[PDB]
Amino acid sequence: QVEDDIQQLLKKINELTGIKESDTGLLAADKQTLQSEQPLQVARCTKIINADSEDPKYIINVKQFAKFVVDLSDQVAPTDIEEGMRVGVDRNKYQIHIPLPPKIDPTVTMMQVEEKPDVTYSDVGGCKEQIEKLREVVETPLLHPERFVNLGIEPPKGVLLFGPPGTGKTLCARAVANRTDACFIRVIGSELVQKYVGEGARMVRELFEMARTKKACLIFFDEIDAIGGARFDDGAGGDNEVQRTMLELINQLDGFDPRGNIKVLMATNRPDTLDPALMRPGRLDRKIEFSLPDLEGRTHIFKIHARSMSVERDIRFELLARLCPNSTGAEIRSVCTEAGMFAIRARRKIATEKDFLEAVNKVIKSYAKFSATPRYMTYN
Amino acid sequence: ENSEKIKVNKTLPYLVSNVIELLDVKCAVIKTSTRQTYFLPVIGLVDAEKLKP
Amino acid sequence: VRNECDPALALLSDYVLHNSNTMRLGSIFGLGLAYAGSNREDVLTLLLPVMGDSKSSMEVAGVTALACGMIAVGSCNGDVTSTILQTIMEKSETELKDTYARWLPLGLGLNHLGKGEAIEAILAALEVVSEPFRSFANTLVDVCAYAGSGNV
């Protein structure tokens, strides 16, 4: 309390203090700039139909109003004003005041990641081969962009990840967007199909629109199965809307007019329901699989997972890994944390072999009926 | 000629209007880019031929 | 540090000696950082009259006060308490500039920290001259030690 006593009074000093000069000094950062830019201006945005020559007079449709063929700002050349360019229009005077850039809607920007998911290549044990190629599709071309010219070639401009549910594909997205640097666009096909007809087409564009103005960006599509994979067809025209959306993605994803530095990452569990047009190379080159860890792998998965907790140092995860034939690296995680309960269920700090053994037999086995890793292996 | 024409024409504000009926009883109605129909009895600067819906 | 084995820091005090521009300058630098923990009245008694001499482009004593601020840090030096009270108040030699105002002001601000009733004359060179460095620091002599609070 004496220290605590000193704490209170000390704080009260400033409290007492702050009030003092407060009385003394009794807007301009802005009220200037506000009033400064109050004599400034507004300008209704405009959509240019097109300009004309032997003189200028640019021709334009604003928006809620209509078309006005109108003069342009003196401060903008007759070039830096290409068609299809949302420009700003002296409101009253109705004359090009200044130019601008393009729309992208509030659905494409809402998915530009901003932050970054902490998932370094340390958590990605048991994939010395998976990440190995991935780094080629995404890492190396985006960073060291010399070699591929020193020898002149091109990298798997897009790459496919598949495997049952629980191999670590979303970590590789998270892994990449972590130690990547480029622009990682997280777009889920769940996002792609909406309500009104021909709406997804706008998304891919925006996607490819926004992918473009920003050289070297990773578009990633997890659950592409949602967007569109098969091209049925019959007397119902069901999965039609989505199909086009795929064709849209297809078209813009590698068909006439290059794409650019838009690298591509697709994540699926069923890499079997996917249109040849996606799969083909150009569009989707490097095809990478995510095995269900064997022996040495799981040991890395166990060691990685348990490496971050108070475990018994005698017990060797190798034994446990042995009792784990074909369980994804996710389940192996329910064990490592599973013991947590057991270890906590008594009152103990450190877990024992059996604690894991039970967990192994408690998770794996018990939660076997579910698993779904054997039904999703054949991609059903 | 040049004088007033520049004042009236010089007005770079231009509200494009899709012609509709070209009544020759030299009359002709038009609907504005503001979606407004105004029967102009003086097609003004613009030959008939130039005229059509 | 202090010197452990080879006392390169202390011998430096020999090389400091000169009331000239760059010599004093980095020696002031050297001896400021020399005499943090090696603190000595000499460098003062060297720089104090150089401070009384008050020439930044030659005597270099301007920044010296700051190096002097780097000498007895966190201690009550009644001398520097008085010494800059004897210089700054006196406005020794060239001072018109807010320079010899502030070189001496913050000179006191560093040395005193944590002496209680003994730190009162630090403001005398600091919050004396009205700047944004002035009416505030009036109570900053209070928080002359904490390292874990200030957001207020």
Ligand SMILES: Nc1ncnc2c1ncn2[C@@H]1O[C@H](COP(=O)(O)OP(=O)(O)O)[C@@H](O)[C@H]1O
């Ligand atoms: N080899 C591995 N190394 C580290 N973590 C793994 C590994 N395999 C699976 N996991 C874990 O299991 C989860 C599986 O995620 P993911 O495979 O993306 O799910 P889905 O199959 O639904 O896309 C991940 O969160 C990851 O933490």
